[PDB]
Design a protein around this nucleic acid. Structure first.
Lengths: 89, 93
DNA sequence: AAATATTTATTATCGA
DNA sequence: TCGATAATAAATATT
């Protein structure tokens, strides 16, 4: 019972390293973040767009190809082989 | 050829240098160019500086635009006390 | 008209 | 009072 004002930044690449295959999608993001804590909600476009723009400022992300496991838009999103050893932690 | 001039005063001067005084945001730059052309649109560096003046003041108001004026930007105007203050001492050193 | 990602754009924090 | 990192709204491009 307290205020979580800190978890808007590192919730993006988290689902990469918390997982085992390191390429979970927005579906896995949603279901796992929901399964984690009992207050946050996906029924708000505000917080959704907030977490959406949290990915553009820092210049370390990149787009990586994927086949028809859900690809109609195009490639998935992950990190760069350079800013690697700073996101496992 | 950028100006060493007060940027809030730059916005207010652009304001008084018009009749409608409520032009769109995407034209604001052009007007400053009309005075002192230096900057290039590709340079994304010094934008936050002008932003600091645009957002942080106490003589402007924020009012939502009309749905037909659907572009990127809003309209701003001055304050009567700010008007009568700037009308006297606007261009000193 | 509802919800993915390259640019734009208020509140406020730091630093000079 | 002029500049550099973060944290937040509302309107284009993309599927």
């Amino acid at each position: 019972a307290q205020k979580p004002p800190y978890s808007y930044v590192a919730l993006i690449a988290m689902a990469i390293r918390e997982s085992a295959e390191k390429r979970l999608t927005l579906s896995g993001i949603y279901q796992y973040i929901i399964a984690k804590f009992p207050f946050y909600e996906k029924n708000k476009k505000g917080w959704q767009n907030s977490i959406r723009h949290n990915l553009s400022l820092n210049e370390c992300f990149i787009k990586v190809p994927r086949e028809g496991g859900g690809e109609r838009k195009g490639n998935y999103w992950t990190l760069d082989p350079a800013c690697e050893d700073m996101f496992e932690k």
